[PDB]
Design a protein around this ligand. Structure first.
Ligand SMILES: *[C@@H]1O[C@H](CO)[C@@H](O)[C@H](O)[C@H]1NC(C)=O
Ligand SMILES: *[C@@H]1O[C@H](CO)[C@@H](O)[C@H](O)[C@H]1NC(C)=O
Ligand SMILES: *[C@@H]1O[C@H](CO)[C@@H](O)[C@H](O)[C@H]1NC(C)=O
Ligand SMILES: [Cl-]
Lengths: 103, 172
């Protein structure tokens, strides 16, 4: 809940797999919630904001991803919260698409 | 008194690398209009390279040790330690002494051309950060409680592997 005030920009191809999966999740969560048809393409850029506490610190991902909407490639901004208190797959881990907006 | 000492920088920043990794060492020192050469030292010995950055395509154990550099307008740098390890898995860091409030950037690196999944970072034998794939562990603000022995753990291919431990101290 309480995050560090700094927001780190993720250099090119750092955490690419974790980030590319969180992007797909974000799209899938958007399509499920708004019954949309967006098709993921790639992550453009990513930022990370880290939780304050010592153990199992959550991360807040600010993702800029490209998705196809009826063939039209468009940019979107995804905000995803991830707090893993145990090694996945476990139901104690939380993953939530908090915001999904176009650009 | 205060001299303009050159500064060796690693690219990537990891001072612990696995064999076969690429490592670039850059000299942060100003050139003169006539002398744009760089003096590179390895274990107090002057090596042949005189370029801005000393490139290591595939690191070997012989590449470990201390490195220093110097340019025309700077002074012989302090030494930077490079450790080359051989293992399936490795916990990487830019250094092992961090000032309080500085960021601690850790990376779990698997042997050349191996997949790493379900990475866990542990401090003093306790799980601290769990990932599904292989993400770096970034701690933006180091504190006194961040000191300890660290290692990372994951699946290298299909083998569950734990890396060697690394001590990290925080100075107040
Ligand atoms: C440099 O010194 C380190 C530490 O003693 C050693 O491991 C390495 O083999 C040395 N390399 C050369 C080229 O002398
Ligand atoms: C810098 O250049 C001058 C003349 O160009 C030379 O005399 C001097 O030795 C050089 N210093 C270094 C550290 O290369
Ligand atoms: C960490 O430092 C302690 C000294 O407090 C030492 O006994 C131990 O062997 C060190 N461990 C590693 C992995 O360097
Ligand atoms: Cl960094």
């Amino acid at each position: 809940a309480q995050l560090h005030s700094t927001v780190r920009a993720v250099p090119g191809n750092e955490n690419s797999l974790e980030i590319e999966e969180l992007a797909r999740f974000a799209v899938d969560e958007h399509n499920k919630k708004e019954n949309a048809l967006l098709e993921f393409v790639r992550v453009v850029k990513a930022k990370e904001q880290y939780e304050d506490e010592h153990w199992f610190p959550g991360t807040m991902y600010y993702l800029t991803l490209e998705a196809k909407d009826g063939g039209k490639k468009k940019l979107y901004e995804a905000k995803v919260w991830v707090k893993n208190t145990a090694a996945p797959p476990s139901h104690m881990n939380f993953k939530e698409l908090q915001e999904f907006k176009p650009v | 008194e205060d001299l303009p000492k050159a500064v060796v920088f690693l690219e990537p920043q990891w001072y612990r690398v696995l064999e076969k990794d690429s490592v670039t060492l850059k000299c942060q020192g100003a050139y003169s209009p006539e002398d744009n050469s760089t003096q590179w030292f390895h274990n107090e010995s002057l090596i042949s390279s005189q370029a801005s950055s000393y490139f290591i395509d595939a690191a070997t154990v012989d590449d470990s040790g201390e490195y220093r550099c110097q340019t025309n307008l700077s002074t012989l740098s302090d030494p930077v330690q490079l450790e080359v390890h051989i293992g399936w898995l490795l916990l990487q860091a830019p250094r092992w002494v961090f000032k309080e409030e500085d960021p601690i950037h850790l990376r779990c690196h698997s042997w050349k051309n191996t997949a790493l999944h379900k990475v866990t970072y542990l401090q003093n034998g306790k799980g601290r950060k769990y990932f599904h794939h292989n993400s770096d562990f970034y701690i933006p603000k180091a504190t006194l409680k961040d000191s300890g022995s660290y290692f990372c753990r994951g699946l290298v291919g299909s083998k569950n592997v734990s890396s060697e431990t690394v001590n990290i101290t925080i100075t107040q």
